[PDB]
Amino acid sequence: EFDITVVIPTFKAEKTVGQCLESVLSQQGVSTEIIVVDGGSPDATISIVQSFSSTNLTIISEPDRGIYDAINKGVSRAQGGMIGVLGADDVYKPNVLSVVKENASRGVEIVAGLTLIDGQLRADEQYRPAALISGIPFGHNAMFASQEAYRKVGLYDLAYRICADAEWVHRAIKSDISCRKVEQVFVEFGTNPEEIIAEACSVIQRNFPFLLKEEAKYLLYGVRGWGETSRIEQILRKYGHESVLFVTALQEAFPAVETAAALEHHHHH
């Protein structure tokens, strides 16, 4: 097989898909498979991809139901031990694929790096319970996951057109999938905000079904620093009895509520 599979969903990416592919082929010291999942691009996208006649590139061009449908198709076919997803507007940094192969040899099922968004580091969060009341903790395109990890967790849920990656990672956390965060930039990155938020809140309720939508939004804003946090102790007392995982998530995310978390663990778990 291969050390790495890179799944590249494309639709009308003719402007950048050549730079994206160059950043993958420049990776040395790893056997790499590339699976381009195109949704029927009418521009030069296929003409450009076919310029990269690497004997380890696969082109899938057929109607799909959105990016995560296209991602699902590529992950399903991936024959590499570690699988990564690279948008056509993104580029891998030098040496990242060997860094992923190195950290995977120890058995870690997920290897995640840093993300450069407009020359700024994405404000990542830790892969831990506290992620479950937030969005995706690391950049999706900076994540690599083994064949086993996908086989354990499943595919991306097409009900989420934006944050299906966050939902998958939360399922990974909840499934105790091993993760090692590498403090190196893996990718340089190239949608209505309301829709982003709506999907993030729904993903959070999927971890903790007892939360009203407003309550999930308050937690997201509290963790992301977008809103206040005075009502965290209220939320904790209201639902702490439900899940030890929920109590763990809030005390990690909001260290100010530790003494209150102690009480929930004591009276309920």
Ligand X SMILES: Nc1nc2c(ncn2[C@@H]2O[C@H](COP(=O)(O)O)[C@@H](O)[C@H]2O)c(=O)[nH]1
Ligand Y SMILES: C[C@@H]1O[C@@H](O)[C@@H](O)[C@H](O[C@H]2O[C@H](C)[C@H](O)[C@H](O[C@@H]3O[C@H](CO)[C@@H](O)[C@H](O)[C@H]3O)[C@@H]2O)[C@@H]1O
Q: Decide whether 168 or 264 has the Cβ nearer to ligand Y.
A: 168
Q: Decide whether 161 or 238 has the Cβ nearer to ligand Y.
A: 161
Q: Decide whether 70 or 169 has the Cβ nearer to ligand X.
A: 70
Is the distance from CB of 206 to CB of 171 less than 8 angstroms? no
CA distances from 233 to 11, 133, 244, 258 (A): 45, 15, 15, 10
Q: Does 136 bind ligand Y (CB under 6 A)?
A: yes
Q: Decide whether 30 or 169 has the Cβ nearer to ligand Y.
A: 169
Sequence-distant (6+) residues with CB within 8 A of 128 are 137, 173, 252
Tell me, residue by residue from 141 to 180, as one string, x for binding to ligand Y by CB under 6 A and - for no binding.
Answer: x--------------------xx-xx--------------
42, 63, 193, 255: which one binds ligand Y (CB under 6 A): 193
Query: For residue 126, what is the DSSP state?
Result: -
Token pair 């507007």 is at which residue? 89
Query: For residue 142, what is the DSSP state?
Result: G
Q: Decide whether 31 or 76 has the Cβ nearer to ligand X.
A: 76
Cα angle 199, 204, 208 (rounded to 5 degrees) comes to 145
Q: Does 114 bind ligand Y (CB under 6 A)?
A: no
Residue 139 interacting partner from ligand X, ligand Y, none (CB closer than 5 to 8 Å by kind): ligand Y
What is the closest distance, in whole angstroms, from the C-beta atom of residue 8 to ligand X in the complex? Answer: 7
What is the closest distance, in whole angstroms, from the C-beta atom of residue 98 to ligand X in the complex? Answer: 24
Interacting residues toward ligand X by CB under 6 A: 9-11, 13, 37-39, 64, 66-67, 70, 87-89
Is the distance from CB of 41 to CB of 11 less than 8 angstroms? yes
Cα angle 215, 131, 74 (rounded to 5 degrees) comes to 115
